[PDB]
Short mmCIF file of all heavy atoms in Angstrom, two decimals:
data_model
loop_
_atom_site.label_atom_id
_atom_site.label_comp_id
_atom_site.label_asym_id
_atom_site.label_seq_id
_atom_site.Cartn_x
_atom_site.Cartn_y
_atom_site.Cartn_z
N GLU A 17 30.10 51.07 91.93
CA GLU A 17 31.11 51.55 90.98
C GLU A 17 32.24 52.28 91.69
O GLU A 17 33.46 52.19 91.30
CB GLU A 17 30.39 52.30 89.81
CG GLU A 17 31.42 52.87 88.77
CD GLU A 17 32.15 51.75 88.07
OE1 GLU A 17 31.61 50.80 87.69
OE2 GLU A 17 33.36 51.98 87.75
N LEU A 18 31.92 53.10 92.72
CA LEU A 18 33.00 53.86 93.56
C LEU A 18 33.85 52.91 94.27
O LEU A 18 35.04 53.24 94.58
CB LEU A 18 32.29 54.76 94.56
CG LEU A 18 31.45 55.94 94.04
CD1 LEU A 18 30.88 56.79 95.18
CD2 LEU A 18 32.29 56.88 93.08
N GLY A 19 33.38 51.68 94.56
CA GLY A 19 34.06 50.72 95.50
C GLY A 19 34.28 51.38 96.94
O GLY A 19 35.35 51.16 97.48
N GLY A 20 33.37 52.09 97.32
CA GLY A 20 33.55 53.10 98.61
C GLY A 20 33.85 52.27 99.80
O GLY A 20 33.74 51.05 99.96
N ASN A 21 34.21 53.09 100.86
CA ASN A 21 34.57 52.56 102.17
C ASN A 21 33.65 51.71 102.88
O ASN A 21 32.30 52.06 102.92
CB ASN A 21 34.87 53.90 103.09
CG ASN A 21 35.26 53.66 104.51
OD1 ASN A 21 36.28 53.12 104.71
ND2 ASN A 21 34.38 53.98 105.42
N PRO A 22 34.01 50.52 103.53
CA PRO A 22 33.12 49.63 104.17
C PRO A 22 32.60 50.14 105.51
O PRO A 22 33.00 49.71 106.61
CB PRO A 22 33.95 48.35 104.36
CG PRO A 22 35.38 48.82 104.48
CD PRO A 22 35.32 50.00 103.52
N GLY A 23 31.72 51.16 105.49
CA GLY A 23 31.23 51.95 106.65
C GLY A 23 30.74 53.31 106.31
O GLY A 23 30.61 54.15 107.23
N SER A 24 30.14 53.47 105.09
CA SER A 24 29.82 54.76 104.48
C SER A 24 28.60 54.59 103.57
O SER A 24 28.63 55.16 102.53
CB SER A 24 31.00 55.34 103.72
OG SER A 24 32.19 55.66 104.69
N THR A 25 27.53 53.95 103.97
CA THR A 25 26.29 53.89 103.39
C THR A 25 25.62 55.26 103.06
O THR A 25 24.76 55.29 102.24
CB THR A 25 25.34 52.91 104.06
OG1 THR A 25 24.23 52.47 103.25
CG2 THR A 25 24.78 53.32 105.31
N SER A 26 26.00 56.20 103.84
CA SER A 26 25.72 57.62 103.64
C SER A 26 26.29 58.18 102.36
O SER A 26 25.79 59.08 101.71
CB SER A 26 26.03 58.50 104.85
OG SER A 26 27.49 58.21 105.18
N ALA A 27 27.48 57.82 102.06
CA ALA A 27 28.12 58.10 100.64
C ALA A 27 27.18 57.65 99.55
O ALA A 27 26.42 56.73 99.69
CB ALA A 27 29.54 57.47 100.61
N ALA A 28 27.39 58.31 98.34
CA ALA A 28 26.43 58.21 97.21
C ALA A 28 25.02 58.76 97.55
O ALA A 28 24.58 59.47 96.82
CB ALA A 28 26.59 56.70 96.65
N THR A 29 24.48 58.45 98.69
CA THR A 29 23.12 59.04 99.02
C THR A 29 23.27 60.51 99.33
O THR A 29 22.46 61.29 98.83
CB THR A 29 22.62 58.16 100.26
OG1 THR A 29 22.45 56.83 99.86
CG2 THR A 29 21.20 58.67 100.71
N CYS A 30 24.20 60.97 100.19
CA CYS A 30 24.60 62.36 100.27
C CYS A 30 25.13 62.95 99.03
O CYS A 30 24.85 64.12 98.73
CB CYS A 30 25.53 62.53 101.53
SG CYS A 30 24.65 61.90 103.05
N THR A 31 25.83 62.21 98.33
CA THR A 31 26.40 62.68 97.01
C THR A 31 25.42 63.13 95.96
O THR A 31 25.67 64.04 95.26
CB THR A 31 27.22 61.49 96.39
OG1 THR A 31 28.15 60.94 97.37
CG2 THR A 31 28.09 61.87 95.14
N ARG A 32 24.19 62.64 96.19
CA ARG A 32 22.97 63.17 95.29
C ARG A 32 22.92 64.72 95.42
O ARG A 32 22.60 65.47 94.42
CB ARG A 32 21.62 62.46 95.74
CG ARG A 32 20.45 62.92 94.88
CD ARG A 32 19.15 62.30 95.23
NE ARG A 32 18.08 62.83 94.44
CZ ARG A 32 17.61 62.56 93.30
NH1 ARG A 32 18.08 61.49 92.57
NH2 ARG A 32 16.79 63.24 92.66
N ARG A 33 23.09 65.13 96.69
CA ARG A 33 22.96 66.64 97.00
C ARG A 33 24.11 67.52 96.45
O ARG A 33 23.89 68.65 96.13
CB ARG A 33 22.66 66.85 98.50
CG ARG A 33 21.50 66.02 99.10
CD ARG A 33 21.22 66.34 100.47
NE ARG A 33 20.68 67.69 100.78
CZ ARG A 33 20.51 68.40 101.90
NH1 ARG A 33 20.67 67.79 103.00
NH2 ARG A 33 20.08 69.54 101.88
N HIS A 34 25.22 66.89 96.27
CA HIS A 34 26.34 67.45 95.58
C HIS A 34 26.19 67.48 94.15
O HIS A 34 26.29 68.50 93.52
CB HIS A 34 27.67 66.88 96.10
CG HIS A 34 27.89 66.84 97.55
ND1 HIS A 34 28.45 65.81 98.22
CD2 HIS A 34 27.55 67.79 98.38
CE1 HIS A 34 28.57 66.23 99.56
NE2 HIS A 34 27.92 67.42 99.71
N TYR A 35 25.73 66.28 93.52
CA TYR A 35 25.63 66.02 92.09
C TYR A 35 24.54 67.05 91.43
O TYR A 35 24.75 67.70 90.45
CB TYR A 35 25.22 64.70 91.74
CG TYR A 35 25.14 64.24 90.37
CD1 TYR A 35 26.15 63.48 89.80
CD2 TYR A 35 24.18 64.68 89.45
CE1 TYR A 35 26.06 62.93 88.45
CE2 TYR A 35 24.15 64.22 88.10
CZ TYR A 35 25.06 63.31 87.62
OH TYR A 35 25.05 62.88 86.28
N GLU A 36 23.46 67.39 92.30
CA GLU A 36 22.36 68.23 91.75
C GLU A 36 22.72 69.72 91.67
O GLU A 36 21.96 70.54 91.23
CB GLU A 36 21.03 67.97 92.67
CG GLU A 36 21.07 68.58 94.04
CD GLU A 36 19.69 68.54 94.59
OE1 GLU A 36 18.94 69.32 94.30
OE2 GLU A 36 19.46 67.73 95.48
N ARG A 37 23.95 70.10 92.18
CA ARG A 37 24.49 71.38 91.94
C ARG A 37 25.96 71.41 91.31
O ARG A 37 26.40 72.45 90.91
CB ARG A 37 24.63 72.12 93.26
CG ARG A 37 23.20 72.39 93.93
CD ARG A 37 22.40 73.32 93.00
NE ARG A 37 21.03 73.62 93.79
CZ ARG A 37 20.04 72.63 93.80
NH1 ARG A 37 19.95 71.62 92.99
NH2 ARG A 37 19.01 72.86 94.61
N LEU A 38 26.57 70.17 91.06
CA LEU A 38 27.93 70.13 90.70
C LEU A 38 28.07 69.50 89.24
O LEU A 38 29.21 69.45 88.77
CB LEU A 38 28.65 69.26 91.74
CG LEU A 38 30.18 69.20 91.65
CD1 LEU A 38 30.81 70.64 91.68
CD2 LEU A 38 30.72 68.36 92.93
N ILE A 39 27.07 68.85 88.74
CA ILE A 39 27.03 68.51 87.30
C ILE A 39 25.69 68.34 86.69
O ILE A 39 25.49 68.50 85.52
CB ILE A 39 27.89 67.25 87.03
CG1 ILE A 39 27.99 66.95 85.53
CG2 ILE A 39 27.28 66.00 87.75
CD1 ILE A 39 29.33 66.23 85.24
N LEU A 40 24.52 68.08 87.54
CA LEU A 40 23.21 68.29 87.04
C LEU A 40 22.99 69.59 86.21
O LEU A 40 22.30 69.49 85.12
CB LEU A 40 22.29 68.16 88.24
CG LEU A 40 20.70 68.27 87.84
CD1 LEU A 40 20.27 67.14 86.89
CD2 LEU A 40 19.88 68.07 89.03
N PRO A 41 23.50 70.84 86.59
CA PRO A 41 23.34 71.98 85.77
C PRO A 41 24.42 72.03 84.57
O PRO A 41 24.12 72.82 83.61
CB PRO A 41 23.72 73.19 86.60
CG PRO A 41 24.60 72.56 87.70
CD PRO A 41 24.03 71.15 87.90
N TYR A 42 25.36 71.03 84.48
CA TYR A 42 26.36 71.18 83.30
C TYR A 42 26.11 70.03 82.30
O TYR A 42 26.26 70.14 81.04
CB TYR A 42 27.83 71.34 83.71
CG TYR A 42 28.42 72.77 83.55
CD1 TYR A 42 27.51 73.97 83.84
CD2 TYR A 42 29.62 72.93 83.18
CE1 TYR A 42 28.01 75.13 83.72
CE2 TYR A 42 30.18 74.16 83.01
CZ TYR A 42 29.38 75.44 83.22
OH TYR A 42 29.84 76.57 82.93
N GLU A 43 25.63 68.82 82.70
CA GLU A 43 25.30 67.77 81.77
C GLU A 43 24.19 68.23 80.87
O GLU A 43 23.92 67.63 79.78
CB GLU A 43 24.85 66.43 82.46
CG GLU A 43 23.52 66.56 83.31
CD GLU A 43 23.07 65.16 83.69
OE1 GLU A 43 23.67 64.47 84.71
OE2 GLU A 43 22.06 64.56 83.06
N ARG A 44 23.63 69.36 81.22
CA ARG A 44 22.65 70.06 80.24
C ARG A 44 23.21 70.35 78.83
O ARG A 44 22.53 70.29 77.88
CB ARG A 44 22.15 71.37 81.05
CG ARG A 44 20.98 72.12 80.33
CD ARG A 44 20.49 73.19 81.16
NE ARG A 44 19.26 73.89 80.45
CZ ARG A 44 18.52 74.80 81.12
NH1 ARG A 44 18.68 75.21 82.30
NH2 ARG A 44 17.46 75.24 80.28
N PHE A 45 24.51 70.61 78.74
CA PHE A 45 25.18 70.71 77.42
C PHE A 45 25.40 69.35 76.68
O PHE A 45 25.34 69.27 75.44
CB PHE A 45 26.56 71.56 77.43
CG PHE A 45 27.72 71.00 78.20
CD1 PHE A 45 28.53 69.89 77.55
CD2 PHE A 45 28.15 71.55 79.32
CE1 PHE A 45 29.50 69.30 78.33
CE2 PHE A 45 29.34 70.85 80.07
CZ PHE A 45 29.91 69.88 79.42
N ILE A 46 25.49 68.26 77.55
CA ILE A 46 25.76 67.02 76.91
C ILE A 46 24.39 66.45 76.42
O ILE A 46 24.33 65.85 75.39
CB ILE A 46 26.33 66.01 77.95
CG1 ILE A 46 27.64 66.58 78.58
CG2 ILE A 46 26.58 64.58 77.31
CD1 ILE A 46 28.18 65.68 79.72
#
């Protein structure tokens, strides 16, 4: 869905560690 860079398989996978502090605590209201 990101259509990310052709050489960044670490993207989305490292993004889990950002999401778990950057919206995992706020989707709690949704």
Side-chain angles (χ1 to χ4, degrees):
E17 183 59 46
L18 297 181
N21 179 67
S24 297
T25 195
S26 51
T29 300
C30 299
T31 313
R32 184 180 173 84
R33 304 184 70 184
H34 304 146
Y35 190 109
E36 75 168 283
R37 298 296 178 281
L38 188 61
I39 192 156
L40 181 58
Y42 256 41
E43 70 167 77
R44 192 173 182 169
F45 71 72
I46 306 175

